[PDB]
Amino acid sequence: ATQGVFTLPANTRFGVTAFANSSGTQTVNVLVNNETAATFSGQSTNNAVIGTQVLNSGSSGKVQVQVSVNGRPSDLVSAQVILTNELNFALVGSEDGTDNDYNDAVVVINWPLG
Amino acid sequence: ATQGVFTLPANTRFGVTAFANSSGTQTVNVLVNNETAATFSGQSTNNAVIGTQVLNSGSSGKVQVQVSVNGRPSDLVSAQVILTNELNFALVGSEDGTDNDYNDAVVVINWPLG
Amino acid sequence: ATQGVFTLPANTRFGVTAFANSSGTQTVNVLVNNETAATFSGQSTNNAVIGTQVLNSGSSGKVQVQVSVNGRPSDLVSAQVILTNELNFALVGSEDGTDNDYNDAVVVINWPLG
Amino acid sequence: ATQGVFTLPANTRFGVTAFANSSGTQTVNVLVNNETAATFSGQSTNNAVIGTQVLNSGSSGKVQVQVSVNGRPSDLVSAQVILTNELNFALVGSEDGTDNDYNDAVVVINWPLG
Ligand SMILES: [Ca+2]
Ligand SMILES: [Ca+2]
Ligand SMILES: [Ca+2]
Ligand SMILES: [Ca+2]
Ligand SMILES: [Ca+2]
Ligand SMILES: [Ca+2]
Ligand SMILES: [Ca+2]
Ligand SMILES: [Ca+2]
């Protein structure tokens, strides 16, 4: 099934943050309405927050997270969770190898902000 | 119901990161095995990371997050999500006022690391 | 924080199912647009389905689950999870006692339907 | 990534419930310790509960959900969510066609019981 794609409320600012846990250099692309809006990269086996940024969901509210290592797309897992019908978390995990820990690149999207 | 309490596998490394979205300075205490193991303090209304660290779950694996603003405990909401039966997210949202956006202090705990 | 309240897309069909795990008779009230749309009542300590039905979120899409035992409101825990950005689960757990297993009345709301 | 596989605490009773929302007959298999422990088959576009039973996780605690339509395996999506660090939901969605709603056969596993 498709993973890493989330529908946020339109024209809403959200935070996107990436974590690295791999010996390979991670590259995270965040697309809004099918267009890259932010890219983060880094190499850490100690959960370094390789990047964070505030984006606007735009008119479509469509957000997609892509993870690649040296140009090679990683296998993704994701889900969205809503707490007290207000706080939203869109989560993504990724595997760039076969040890299957799926934390090589971890991305958390949260909203609302402010 | 109790919130902000998670049972992680014992003696395991996990990451804890806090984001702030409030006019008030957020104080995030992380207790492991019933003893404070880390504390983050910061202020932001733009989802800035006010702290991130790697900790160990201790002998019981019990990890608790508490949030307060100038001594006043914030109401918490939380949940744990597991993807592909191995990637874990312990999530916490908190409210320091009455607008109930529960993002004043957002905390993400993730494991495994490395 | 408020629990058991979910905002579904307006005028959408959804399923609601209640399970019981308590010595006490569980009374589950499902409100739509702040009005009772269905009530399930039964007793079971073996996860028996005390009710399942197809409802409509109505104009507002506001859905709320209330659980009471002998008239006394049970404490609730809840969250919404969305898989592959299409499959939604509105989950509710309730506690009518002190053992805090929060399964005394378990309610699962799912959409979209077929 | 692998989906529909869950690790529950060993020798623990859990509930497994399947809903149907497809034009095709859904075949849901629940394997405990790599052995078929329950099977539900049915057709419904209105969330009929085609099956709900209480099973024991066995010595391994490994539980797997498989869904097929007339011998053809459906693609699965899944996740586990834990509320108040006590109530567990193992969620599964399945897709038999081309409308990516993954609600053709929906399975919910919950524990603890009683
Ligand atoms: Ca890996
Ligand atoms: Ca890794
Ligand atoms: Ca607030
Ligand atoms: Ca706020
Ligand atoms: Ca109870
Ligand atoms: Ca109970
Ligand atoms: Ca379908
Ligand atoms: Ca369907």
Q: What are the structural domain ranges in chain B?
A: 1-114
Are residues D45 and D25 in contact, defined by beta-carbon separation less than 8 angstroms? no
Residues of B in contact with A49 (CB under 8 A): 17, 49, 52
Q: What is the resolution of this structure in A?
A: 1.8
Are residues A40 and A20 in contact, defined by beta-carbon separation less than 8 angstroms? no
Residues of A in contact with B79 (CB under 8 A): 81, 83
- The β-bridge relationship of strands D72-73 and C35-56 is unpaired
CA of B33 vs chain A CAs: smallest distance (Å): 22
Are residues D77 and D29 in contact, defined by beta-carbon separation less than 8 angstroms? no
The method recorded for this entry reads: X-ray
Residues 6 or more apart from A112 whose CB is under 8 A from it?
A: A12, A13, A14, A86, A87, A88, B21, B101, B103
Residues of A in contact with D95 (CB under 8 A): 1
Query: Using CA of residue D98, residue D100, residue D103, residue D105, what is the dihedral sign?
Result: positive
CA of B113 vs chain A CAs: smallest distance (Å): 6
The CATH T-level fold of domain C1-114 is Jelly Rolls (2.60.120)
Distance A11 CA to ligand 2 centre (A): 34
Distance B102 CA to ligand 8 centre (A): 34
Cα-Cα-Cα-Cα dihedral of B30, B5, D90, C45, to 10°? 170
Residues of B in contact with A91 (CB under 8 A): 81, 83, 89
Query: Using CA of residue B55, residue B57, residue B59, residue B63, what is the dihedral sign?
Result: positive
Distance A74 CA to ligand 1 centre (A): 9
Largest CA distance in chain D: 40
DSSP label of C104: S
Residue D32 to residue D34: CA distance in whole angstroms? 5
CA within 13 Å, CB half, B34: 2
Residue pairs between chains A and B whose CB atoms are closer than 8 Å: 103
* Token digits of residue B107: 């905390």
* Token digits of residue D71: 């011998």
Residue D61 to residue D53: CA distance in whole angstroms? 16
Query: Using CA of residue C39, residue D81, residue B50, residue A27, what is the dihedral sign?
Result: negative
